[PDB]
Design a protein around this motif. Structure first.
Motif, PDB file in Angstrom:
ATOM      1  N   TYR A  10       9.124  31.518  39.113  1.00 46.03           N
ATOM      2  CA  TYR A  10       8.316  31.920  37.908  1.00 46.03           C
ATOM      3  C   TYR A  10       8.623  31.867  37.310  1.00 46.03           C
ATOM      4  CZ  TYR A  10       4.096  32.123  35.606  1.00 46.03           C
ATOM      5  OH  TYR A  10       3.094  32.836  33.950  1.00 46.03           O
ATOM      6  N   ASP A  11       9.428  33.358  36.774  1.00 44.25           N
ATOM      7  CA  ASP A  11       9.488  33.766  35.916  1.00 44.25           C
ATOM      8  C   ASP A  11      10.754  32.617  34.644  1.00 44.25           C
ATOM      9  OD1 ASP A  11       9.032  35.536  33.947  1.00 44.25           O
ATOM     10  OD2 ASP A  11      10.830  36.672  33.721  1.00 44.25           O
ATOM     11  N   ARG A  14       9.465  29.047  33.555  1.00 42.56           N
ATOM     12  CA  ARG A  14       8.289  29.776  32.623  1.00 42.56           C
ATOM     13  C   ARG A  14       9.514  30.207  31.326  1.00 42.56           C
ATOM     14  NH1 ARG A  14       7.447  34.573  29.437  1.00 42.56           N
ATOM     15  NH2 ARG A  14       8.583  36.156  30.863  1.00 42.56           N
ATOM     16  N   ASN A  19       7.317  22.253  32.125  1.00 47.45           N
ATOM     17  CA  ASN A  19       5.857  21.949  32.348  1.00 47.45           C
ATOM     18  C   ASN A  19       5.769  21.015  33.612  1.00 47.45           C
ATOM     19  OD1 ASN A  19       5.064  19.181  31.831  1.00 47.45           O
ATOM     20  ND2 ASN A  19       3.448  20.064  31.838  1.00 47.45           N
ATOM     21  N   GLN A  41      -2.016  24.249  33.689  1.00 45.73           N
ATOM     22  CA  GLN A  41      -0.524  24.607  33.499  1.00 45.73           C
ATOM     23  C   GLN A  41       0.654  23.975  33.240  1.00 45.73           C
ATOM     24  OE1 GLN A  41       0.172  29.232  34.101  1.00 45.73           O
ATOM     25  NE2 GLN A  41      -1.896  29.831  32.836  1.00 45.73           N
ATOM     26  N   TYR A  42       0.673  23.471  34.616  1.00 48.15           N
ATOM     27  CA  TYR A  42       1.992  22.667  35.046  1.00 48.15           C
ATOM     28  C   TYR A  42       1.873  21.256  36.526  1.00 48.15           C
ATOM     29  CZ  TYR A  42       5.059  27.469  33.887  1.00 48.15           C
ATOM     30  OH  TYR A  42       5.949  28.028  33.531  1.00 48.15           O
TER      31      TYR A  42
END
Length: 138
Positions: A10-11, A14, A19, A41-42
């Motif tokens: 995830y990081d 991000r 996206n 968000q995605y």
């Protein structure tokens, strides 16, 4: 520094900023990653070669899904490609590794032809182990 594999994935995604995510996988590791990526968000599309398994997985996380035919079509339409399945040989060969995309191969054996342009589960465990140790220090 994050230690759990899905937290690190995830990081990385991000920080990349994309996206649209292509998730090629529908097993336990995919299931661990899914909770981290949610619409709006995605925009995750789950893709696979076994459509009933793909559908069932997508229904659980309310994802769009597709049967793989032309993987280049899917890569062209997404920012981030995460593979987490089992394939005898790579699903994604070198010629498909387009510029400006993030490729994360969590498969065993590799779902993506190996190289400096593709980060692997083993590399994400290197991050994980280093952080696991660093956060115990000081």
């Amino acid at each position: 520094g994050k230690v759990s594999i899905p937290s690190i994935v995830y990081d990385i995604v991000r920080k990349n900023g994309g996206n649209k995510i292509l998730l090629v996988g529908n097993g336990m590791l995919a299931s661990e990653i899914a909770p981290y990526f949610s619409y709006p968000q995605y925009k995750v599309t789950v893709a696979g070669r076994n459509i009933d398994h793909v559908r069932a997985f997508a229904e659980k996380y309310e994802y769009e899904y597709v049967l793989i035919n032309d993987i280049d079509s899917l890569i062209k339409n997404n920012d981030v490609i995460i593979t987490a399945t089992s394939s005898k040989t790579p699903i994604v060969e070198e010629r498909s590794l387009m510029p400006g995309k993030l490729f994360i191969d969590l498969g065993n054996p590799p779902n993506i032809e190996r190289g400096n342009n593709v980060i692997t589960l083993d590399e994400i465990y290197e991050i994980s182990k280093k952080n696991e140790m660093l956060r115990e220090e000081k």
